[PDB]
Write a protein that binds this DNA or RNA. Sequence first.
RNA 1: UAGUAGGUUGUAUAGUAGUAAGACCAGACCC
RNA 2: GGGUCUGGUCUUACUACUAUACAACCUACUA
Lengths: 347, 347, 348, 347, 271
Amino acid sequence: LEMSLENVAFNVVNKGHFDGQQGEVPVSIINNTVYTKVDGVDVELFENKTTLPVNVAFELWAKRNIKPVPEVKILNNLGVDIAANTVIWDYKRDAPAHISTIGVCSMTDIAKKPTETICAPLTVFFDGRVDGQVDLFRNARNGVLITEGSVKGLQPSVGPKQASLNGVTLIGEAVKTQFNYYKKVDGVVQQLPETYFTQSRNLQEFKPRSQMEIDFLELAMDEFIERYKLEGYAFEAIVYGDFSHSQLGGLHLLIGLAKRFKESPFELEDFIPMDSTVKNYFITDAQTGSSKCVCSVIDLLLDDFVEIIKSQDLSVVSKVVKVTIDYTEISFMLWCKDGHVETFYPK
Amino acid sequence: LEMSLENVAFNVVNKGHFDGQQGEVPVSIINNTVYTKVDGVDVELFENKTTLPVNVAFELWAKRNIKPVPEVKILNNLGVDIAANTVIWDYKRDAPAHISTIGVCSMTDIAKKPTETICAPLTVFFDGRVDGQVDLFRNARNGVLITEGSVKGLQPSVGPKQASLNGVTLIGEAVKTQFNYYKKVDGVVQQLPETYFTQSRNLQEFKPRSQMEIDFLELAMDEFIERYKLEGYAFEAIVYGDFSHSQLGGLHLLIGLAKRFKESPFELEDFIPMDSTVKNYFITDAQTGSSKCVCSVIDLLLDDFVEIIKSQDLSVVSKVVKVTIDYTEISFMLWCKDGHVETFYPK
Amino acid sequence: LEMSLENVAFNVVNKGHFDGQQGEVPVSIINNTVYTKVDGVDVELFENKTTLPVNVAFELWAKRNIKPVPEVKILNNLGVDIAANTVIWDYKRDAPAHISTIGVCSMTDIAKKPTETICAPLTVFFDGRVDGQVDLFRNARNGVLITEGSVKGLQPSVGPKQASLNGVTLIGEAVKTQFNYYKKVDGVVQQLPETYFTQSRNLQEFKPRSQMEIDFLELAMDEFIERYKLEGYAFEAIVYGDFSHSQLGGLHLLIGLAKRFKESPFELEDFIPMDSTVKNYFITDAQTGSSKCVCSVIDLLLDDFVEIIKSQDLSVVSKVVKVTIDYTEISFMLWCKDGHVETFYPKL
Amino acid sequence: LEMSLENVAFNVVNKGHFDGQQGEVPVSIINNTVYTKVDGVDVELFENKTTLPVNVAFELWAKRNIKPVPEVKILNNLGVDIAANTVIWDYKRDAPAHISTIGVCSMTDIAKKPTETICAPLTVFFDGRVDGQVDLFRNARNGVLITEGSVKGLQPSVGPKQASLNGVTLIGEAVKTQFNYYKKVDGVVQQLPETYFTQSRNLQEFKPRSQMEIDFLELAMDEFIERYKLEGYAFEAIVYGDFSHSQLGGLHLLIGLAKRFKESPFELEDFIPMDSTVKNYFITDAQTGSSKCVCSVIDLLLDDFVEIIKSQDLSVVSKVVKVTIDYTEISFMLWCKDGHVETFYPK
Amino acid sequence: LEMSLENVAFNVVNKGHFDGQQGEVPVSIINNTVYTKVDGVDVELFENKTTLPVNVAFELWAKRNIKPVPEVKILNNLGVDIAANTVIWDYKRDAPAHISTIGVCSMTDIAKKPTETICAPLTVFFDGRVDGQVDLFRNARNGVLITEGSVKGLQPSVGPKQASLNGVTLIGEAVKTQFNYYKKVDGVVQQLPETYFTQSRNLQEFKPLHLLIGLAKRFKESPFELEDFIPMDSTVKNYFITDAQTGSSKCVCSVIDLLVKVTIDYTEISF
RNA sequence: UAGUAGGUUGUAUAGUAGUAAGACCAGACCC
RNA sequence: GGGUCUGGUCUUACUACUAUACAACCUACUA
């Protein structure tokens, strides 16, 4: 089997997600909210924040993937258009990561199997922990495959350490959250270039993942620059920021935002609440009264950021640098003075 | 069995009402409308005009009674509070005639059988064309029973000739629309009083049902009164109406409204769109510019109204007359100008 | 008292409009509809088609004017911005004719009396059948006054014969629907221009109001033109209409639309459902398959239209003619050639 | 172009449809209705009855095709999935006939030209009155082409006489509403089979289109059979209908419905308000009280129906007959008594 | 009395709850929100999260009980179906704890007094701090009574130490939040058996994996997410716990906050 | 007199439209 | 080659709307 609204609500009530049990419960759809009657009183089960109909969005939310899955930004950068026999929920915007589905909900389904002709001109995300998906990826024309282990006859590409698990990114210890990515286009397997992976942290629950990051949060700016020999790279304004004018200077790394937040609180108004490698924020410092309309914040490991920034050479005043991050090219606007660097920020 | 939204929509699509078949179709609930996907495009199936949730109202509408059923005004006057194992749809206001149901929809059910203790202090409408309902009526404490035939041990009460059938009232020829009404209160059968029944007609599809009505519509105002000897009974004002002042005079019978509508069109704004024995209208005559804020219109057979007015014994100046219409008392405001009648209109 | 939602609903239930009685009834506001509980079941009382909140629109609808009132187009053309101590309901779009009110609903009120300073730079519609309104009009700076009779010290202006009464326009017989209009601007009484008044009819309930209209509805096109000496005025196109090409021809008078509708049914899609002197329609003829995207239809008495079309010389290649209709200037495009008119249509 | 909501509303206000002019007007989107401010008061321009967003549906409605276009049922039967550079509005359900568009609205566009790779595995409706569309049809892989005239190198297929024009079907006189249909699948032109075309009439504005229909609407049931020699074809029940039992007998042609409506009014509740060759109705006769839950009504010319019924032979008790109507197969359930056909109704 | 929407909004504006004052203020009902006009600009007063109409829910919210009241789980376990002359607001789901009311709001009222025949086959929650309610409980057929003190002729049952007060549970010091529970069924007083009472704490404001104390200890150690897929109030809570450090998650986790059939909160819990 | 300015009108360079007609180009049908 | 019908463009005459520049009239605030 039954694929109906009341069976989905029964599964949500008894297990929190659509498992596949048999049963039905009373359901009331008023406004965009789905209520259920428990002990004679209506209890809210789901509030629709999406653009889909109420029952369609509820069914997709209940059938979401609860296993560790790749972050939505990785899938978007890899060009994934649809997911095979699963729903990947984008918790950043509280909506499904993909408009259509394959064999999940009859209202949004374009097919019941990923091997149909309609699914051929689409990059389909194939899981690896579900049996039989590797064969479907081999027979698919366009598809992206993730695997905990290794696949015979293919060259694995190491992905990010962290992965999304019910909306909270983590480096799994009990469960393996590091996958191997395979991309197949037009029936030909394509290798993927080596890329630096964003750590996807947050200001509140910020924890350094390296010794250099620990020194950045604790040691002074001059001491940290002197110890690691970061002179002549404009590290004062690129990371720490300039809270002295009406507009901020630099501050394009999430680690600098975390350091400033620990020093003085401020507001990060995200005017595009989605998940992406590069985030734009409406930052307003509450102490110095300095605000910036657009602030491109990219969360990178500090050691790899140093390696990236020191592998471009100081020879021209201005240059555009293309860096492969999350399997996509990132355009960095680089300004260089003579002897030192002026400014290096993402576009 | 399955009791779900998609099975109900499948039954509506394939048969127009909930029959009890097995199947499911895609359903989208957006706004108060229930859409279904037919040939890849959404088709509207039901628009909620009720005060209930969208899916609850849709399920009640699909499970409505399609057999000839008594008019909602008769049930309200008899004091019916709930219907046993059926839904009676009030097409006048496009909502169920009763707030709760017995064994129909889990969201509105108060019980699964009419014999439970919760249903005891309620007048339950028991059908007669469904097997086993007569026994339930006998065992019920408060209930109203309708029967095409006769029931042993009970005195039948003849009901109205017409009955509702999918929202259009008719005097059935192929199907019997005349029932026998039995009312049982506190376990004791009560014999219903002798009463007149409203014909429940409309101005557009108005057809006379007696010789007197045909003469009323065909003959002039003076000719009709002279032929039937209605002098000194205010038939000109009460029935025909007086469109000569800023406010109307009389016009409290639907037959007079039909005659005027055939003569000159006008607007009847019903500010309480429900079904009742006495209707109040905001009548505005479009020819003479005469309007009346409240106009109590009661549809009665002309012969019965003549009998009622001739039995009034007009001797006192003012008197309140109680007339049993549709198993309920109707308060008629009677004014008599000593010698003849002054005005006789319902309150 | 009391000015509350439940008292308003009680008045609607017991009398159909807000009279001023004391009482309350259960009320449920869900969606844009206002329901009431009668005999244990919810009954719909009002569905909000306006741009106002549900209870605000319900209160304005209940307090609407039920007496014969001037049509909304006349008020808009006269420049009326607000109504004094009343609500004028625009039944064409099922919303109040004016955004704000004076002493009606606390949510929309800008004042409690029309004599306040905020109401001074506004043209206020003052009634005449309500006692004391004439004095307010005299003391007002900008205002429009209607009166069944005559007012001392002022020159009356005769208005249209018909007036709106609960959404249906009529030439009242029992009740006088013809008023005298007075307009006062900046404390100085202004006389209103002499004008022709639109009859405001409809295709379904269309009834001729003159001998010429009866002849038009009965006689053939050629016979009517011959009888009324309308030679060389494009009456075949301007009025009767030309359903011969892909686009329509002329057909800019409602009487011609009524004649065609009686001949062959068609659809008039009104893409701006409001009330105005000149109406634009998306007419699609169902017989010949001829449709026109924009069709300016103005309802005028056929004698008045004949006089208007005979009052303009036709030697110029083209000209824009301004005609005072419903106290406003209507622009007519006079595309003519060699004396005989080619077309004559308003704009909207 | 400018493609914005206010430009679309300006075009609607000044011309009734999106022509392509430059300008803007105030717009208010509250509920599903789009209002505009004219002379200081909001005027409703469009009420959304679709499943699309308010502004998307408004833009599609304004950019609809106002020229004579084929009826939506013909396009659905031909398998049209999308329309090239135009929007075909389905006035029966007040929604666009196709979910996606090509180069019309950026919210629903899948491409800007019909020659892109994404549009290749889709049957695209190509007009013929727009210059350059014939070349696109020739270069297209899957597409349907209509032409007023003839196309060199292709065999024309004569379509229906009538065509939709702003929601009202008509046999155009001033404008040609008869097209020639060409279907191309997988780059190979397919000839369409000879077929019968539904006249697509309605009960209210019903006008006979042949001598036989006039005789049917005037002559008696027995006289009409005698004159046209229809004995042993169950013409009494198939077309006229039988209002004698609880359920109707036959009445599967719209001409019979029109005749009955002229005789006695009744209600046709369409529980699937869409456009299709075969329509199912919830017919309830208001005179005899006879109702039928499902009534398959197909509007065919009486001469064509006679030709169909006289070419099936009377040899088996039950048989399924496939008839090509509107370029699609119609399944007719045929029951034959030994000697004469018993019941012949569409499924 | 006056019982109208504008009087209720006036009471909310001037006192925060329906006290019973006389007055009216402009009110706008758009969407499910009730706005009021203060200084010429609309100010939101109430957003409807319930299944009731906007004005009905607003009137019930304004007429809610602000005194210390028993927790909703205790009332549900005791079988309370309706409250006499008061509204008990369930702050966990932001909706009234009972579908119908007695003499509060005309849209939801089934009666004006708890002594009517319609209220007889219902367990009615009778207060004890309101004068005259004890007599109504004595005359009632089915009802539950709470009392700060003692009632003559009845055996008191000691209830939980904590009680709800404007949505925050507390062990009252200035005000007594410990009541004595009396249950009367079919006109016969039934004694309440001994039972253990849930402390009803929370992880954030916790002051001394199926016990809430273990959840609090883990939260102090490592943060995690508790997705409550049934946001209501009950003795036993099911959570969708996902540990953010070890990546360990459990779909259903029955968490009961305590200091085989077990008598907890006047009901039976099966382990 | 030296400056900063809101409404009305005119001139100049421009860009769209207008429910009539004529002309040019292109396509279809017929002779 | 001619006639009719459609898609695009120009002209006929008068007006409406948007953009910029300058001037005049009624006049507003300072030295």
